[PDB]
């Protein structure tokens, strides 16, 4: 098990093959990322939030998240979007990403994207995409403005209060 964004990730089902890919950000900057190519299921465990993740090759399929605060749910969603490696998240980067903090702390590209959206995630949520939802027991929706909804939700995100 590995840690990412303060969340503990564990693969429960599926398989993937790591592949290096060169991607282009929204600020026209190149990055070398290790793409886990294949279908996978993960469990995300944090101090204030918990979620179940489903992904494919650079595609988030399903994220069922719970937590104590609306802020703690936002934290889990962002991490899942960055871990998904989707193009909607890469192309939402507004600025060139550094790989070394001011106090010489080297960072890998995936942690570079995580810190960029942990700071400001308005562009990510706006351009991630919304989708209609069906009245399913224990599953509610949430909008790019963290507004709960029983009719729409951020694409693939379903809060389980």
């Amino acid at each position: 098990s590995f840690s990412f964004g303060g969340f503990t990730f564990k693969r429960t089902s599926g398989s993937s093959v790591k592949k290096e890919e060169e991607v282009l950000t929204g600020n026209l900057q190149t990055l070398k990322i290790r793409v886990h190519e294949g279908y996978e299921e993960f469990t995300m465990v944090g101090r204030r939030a918990t979620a179940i993740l489903r992904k494919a090759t650079r595609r988030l399929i399903q994220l069922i998240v719970s937590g104590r605060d609306e802020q703690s749910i936002a934290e889990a969603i962002i991490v899942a979007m960055v871990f998904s490696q989707e193009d909607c998240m890469i192309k939402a980067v507004r600025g060139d990403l550094n790989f070394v903090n001011r106090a010489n702390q080297r960072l890998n590209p995936m942690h570079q994207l995580l810190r960029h959206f942990q700071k400001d995630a308005k562009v990510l949520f706006q351009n991630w995409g919304i989708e209609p939802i069906d009245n399913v027991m224990g599953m509610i929706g949430i909008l790019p403005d963290m507004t709960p909804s029983t009719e729409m939700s951020l694409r693939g995100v379903r809060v389980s209060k």
Epitope: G141, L143, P144, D145, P148, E151
Partner: nanobody, 120 residues
């Protein structure tokens, strides 16, 4: 927490326009999703539209979509309903509601208003 009172109703000609307003007196207006319902004579409440806590994402009914708009100003604690190309069939009492969820279920809204008469 929140009270709701609607205004702006009255008689208009078919094909007219009427912007309804719903003023709120409460603590955290910004943290409340809103909606508009309407009850025609001899019929139950009908969903018109809902709106996000920010105001960015709105959703309307199949019978008013394209002719009606829902908007809110969180600095004045008011949510408005734009009514366009009004029809004789729009004649009903229009209600204002507030709650936690952006929905079509009248039961999910906790705080309701009084209703304003609109006749076309």
């Amino acid at each position: 927490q929140v009270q709701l009172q609607e205004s702006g109703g009255g008689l208009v000609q078919p094909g007219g326009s009427l912007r309804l307003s719903c003023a709120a007196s409460g603590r955290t207006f910004s943290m409340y999703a809103m909606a508009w319902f309407r009850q025609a004579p001899g019929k139950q409440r009908e969903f018109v539209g809902t709106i996000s806590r920010s105001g960015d994402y709105a959703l309307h009914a199949d019978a008013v979509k394209g002719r009606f708009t829902i908007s809110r100003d969180n600095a004045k604690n008011t949510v408005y309903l734009q009514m366009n190309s009004l029809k004789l069939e729009d004649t009903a009492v229009y209600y204002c509601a507030a709650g936690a969820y952006h929905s079509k279920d009248k039961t999910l809204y906790d705080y309701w208003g009084q209703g304003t008469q609109v006749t076309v």
